[PDB]
């Protein structure tokens, strides 16, 4: 459900900034999805660094 969607979005974002605006938009979408539905915010913070 929400967790798989957020993980897929984060995996897509990982191969974008390294490959910046798209990374920022994907991270914003993941943050919105996490906020709309706990550990997801922690995963977002961990992926931020």
């Amino acid at each position: 459900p929400v967790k798989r969607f957020v993980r897929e979005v984060l995996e897509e974002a990982e191969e974008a900034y390294e490959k910046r605006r798209q990374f920022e938009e994907l991270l914003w979408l993941a943050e919105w999805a996490a906020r709309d539905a706990e550990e997801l915010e922690e995963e977002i913070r961990e992926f931020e660094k």
Binding site: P1, V2, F5, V9, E25, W28, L29, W32, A33, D36
Partner: protein
């Protein structure tokens, strides 16, 4: 001629967010015979009487039909405020309308059951420079903006769907959410009839 109700009794009825619409002009209809095949569990009319819906003659008749579970009878109403009246299906208040909740009896054997019931739980448009969640409320006589990304049936209760709206479409994102209801032993259907008052859609004989 005669108004044709055959497409209702053939094929699998769609979901509430993909309601199938029929328009009838210049024909003779017998509404009591259409409802005879079904076991009407609910029949609520606004701006017209339940007995008078099948008696008058109208300029045009609109019939939307879909698969709808009876357990969500509270959401499918003009006075309701659930997700069904916001993101799935809305009826216009400027015309006489009726909502029917019927059950496909086992003897009718050409209305195939879907896998399960589904509906759009949320449909938002995430803007870019404003970081704003603008809910997309469906208007009367139109489909939801999220029907393009929500599939024919939601796979799991709580699925999330995303579409990258192009900068031309406004950039940002279009996000949706799906919910499901368990299928019943007998298929349950929902109908919405809207009448518009030269009257040529008249009752037969």
């Amino acid at each position: 001629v005669e108004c044709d109700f055959s497409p209702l009794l053939s094929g699998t009825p769609p979901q509430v967010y993909n309601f199938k619409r029929l328009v009838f002009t210049n024909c003779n209809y017998n509404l009591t015979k259409l409802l005879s095949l079904f076991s009407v569990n609910d029949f609520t009319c606004s701006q017209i009487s339940p007995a008078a819906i099948a008696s008058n003659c109208y300029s045009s008749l609109i019939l939307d039909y879909f698969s709808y579970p009876l357990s969500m009878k509270s959401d499918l109403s003009v006075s309701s405020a659930g997700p069904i009246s916001q993101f799935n299906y809305k009826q216009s208040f400027s015309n006489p309308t009726c909502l029917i909740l019927a059950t496909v009896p086992h003897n009718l054997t050409t209305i195939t059951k879907p896998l399960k019931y589904s509906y759009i739980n949320k449909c938002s448009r995430l803007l870019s420079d404003d970081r704003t969640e603008v809910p997309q409320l469906v208007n009367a006589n139109q489909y939801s903006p999220c029907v393009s990304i929500v599939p024919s049936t939601v796979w799991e209760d709580g699925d999330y769907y995303r579409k990258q709206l192009s900068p031309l479409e406004g950039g940002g994102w279009l996000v949706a959410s799906g919910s499901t209801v368990a299928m019943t032993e007998q298929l349950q259907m929902g109908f919405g009839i809207t009448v518009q008052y030269t009257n040529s859609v008249c009752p037969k004989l």
